[PDB]
């Protein structure tokens, strides 16, 4: 259909633009026309509208946290996330296109490996625990926060598998 070709083409990644503007650049574009929003180091305030972001120096503005709510963003739109050195928040909150396959893509990305403490996923309802349990591979997390999954069947098998995998995680589960 037309809004699935939609949906594609708002998520699918424009290389040339990565090689022109740097990746985090590309990826606050990607993000905000999906309806998320950005928030750079060293900033206060949020990118929460295309048109206003930043146009200034090439490549300075770095990506710290992200806050997608009642986004489009989908499976390969998250490999804008590649090229990106300094994510450390993700909040993934009523976005009902997000599958487990995003977050095992997001899992791999040894980028965010490296940088990621922070991450909330409420509400995303195709979410299940094997996407839950693909979150292990960020070692350095300090925070999830869970809410609204009913997808997410084991709370307590998932409580039990960070207890072992990062026992230093606040996991903070808002689940039926
Ligand atoms: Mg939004």
Redesign the pocket.
Known sequence: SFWEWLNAVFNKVDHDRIRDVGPDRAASEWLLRC???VRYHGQQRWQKDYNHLPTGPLDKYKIQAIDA???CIMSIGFDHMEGLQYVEKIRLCKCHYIEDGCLERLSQLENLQKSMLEMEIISCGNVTDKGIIALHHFRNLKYLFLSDLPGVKEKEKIVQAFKTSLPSLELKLDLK
């Open positions: 309806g998320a929003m709510t009642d986004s």
